[PDB]
Design a protein around this nucleic acid. Structure first.
Ligand SMILES: [Ca+2]
Ligand SMILES: [Ca+2]
Length: 313
DNA sequence: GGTAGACCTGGACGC
DNA sequence: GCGTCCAGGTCTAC
């Protein structure tokens, strides 16, 4: 069989993971600005690269159905399904988090009723780092294209489904290579093309390579966030996205225009310790602290729910 | 130390 | 049709 698979077309090639919609809604997570590597190639079926292999995912009321494209088609093995469980951090019980947040935040409770299943993906540091470097002063649709062209040009070719060729995310070496910036500009990444080249070189030639980034996962939020900000193209918001989505800092709250609108419209929030009236390094930091005092240790996760809901509105 | 102004790109809107 | 806005912001002279 050729092309992207559907649960109905190739039954024997799918394996499931127990998962109710209250725990995960692919349609509210995958195209919402966390990861830019997933596409709904066929109604309700999402395809993308996960743990260096291509996968298609789809769900029914109580199951998350998975299929992987590696030779000789066969359903995913238990070890491979584990990769999926970990990518979606399925050990974190979303129902428990929603309950808590909703208990201390009447507005969250209201929104939560209509937007269940919004959880945080646990992403690869490099993929997350450069994808978000590409996200600044930009929109999800455009960002998604940039990331795809980036991987196509500098990432390992994996497999082809229909007319779509999947690529693994580029390595630091590839991104640090000669003339990467110029090539990325022709691929339409704008001024961020330099940020990509410059940051790849900085990590490899000034910070000590991959080890420096990966170690941030063991470091403290304050530690990690400060470290990331030295990288070209990485500001407070991008750094926060990375901490939350790739370095296991569930309290990190990225503050962008969306979160500002939410704060003002749904909580009548306004800076008090800062000086400005709108977004600024001072007010942004304050808003982040506000969201943390409101939701607690997993504030970044709560923010993700409202962000996702704000997109679909 | 804290501020607006510029900035690649392309889909939206309003004149 | 076409100039101003804006999107998961960051980087800088005054
Ligand atoms: Ca903006
Ligand atoms: Ca920086």
């Amino acid at each position: 069989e050729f092309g992207h698979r559907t649960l109905a077309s190739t039954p024997a090639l799918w394996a499931s993971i127990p998962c109710p919609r209250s725990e995960l809604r692919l349609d509210l997570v995958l195209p919402s600005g966390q990861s830019f590597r997933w596409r709904e190639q066929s109604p309700a079926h999402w395809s993308g690269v996960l743990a260096d292999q291509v996968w298609t995912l789809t769900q029914t009321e109580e199951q998350l159905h998975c299929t992987v494209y590696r030779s000789q088609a066969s359903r995913p093995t238990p070890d491979e399904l584990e990769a999926v469980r970990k990518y979606f951090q399925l050990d974190v019980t979303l129902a428990q988090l929603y309950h808590h947040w909703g208990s201390v935040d009447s507005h969250f409770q209201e929104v939560a009723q209509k937007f269940q299943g919004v959880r945080l993906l646990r992403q690869d540091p490099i993929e997350c780092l450069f994808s978000f470097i590409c996200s600044s002063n930009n929109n999800i649709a455009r960002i998604t294209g940039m990331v795809e062209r980036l991987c196509q040009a500098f990432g390992p070719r994996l497999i082809q489904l229909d007319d779509v060729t999947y690529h693994g995310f580029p390595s630091l070496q590839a991104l640090a290579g000669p003339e990467v910036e110029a090539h990325l500009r022709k691929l339409g990444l704008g001024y961020r093309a330099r940020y990509v080249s410059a940051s790849a070189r900085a990590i490899l030639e000034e910070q000590g390579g991959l080890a420096w980034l990966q170690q941030l996962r063991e470091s403290s939020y304050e530690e990690a966030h400060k470290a990331l900000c030295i990288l070209p193209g990485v500001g407070t918001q991008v750094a926060d996205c990375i901490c939350l989505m790739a370095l296991d800092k569930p309290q990190a709250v990225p503050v962008d225009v969306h979160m500002w609108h939410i704060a003002q419209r749904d909580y009548s929030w306004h800076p008090t310790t800062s000086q400005a009236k709108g977004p600024s390094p001072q007010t942004n930091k304050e808003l982040g602290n506000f969201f943390r005092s409101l939701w607690g240790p997993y504030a970044g996760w709560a923010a993700a729910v409202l962000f996702s809901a704000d997109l679909r509105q």
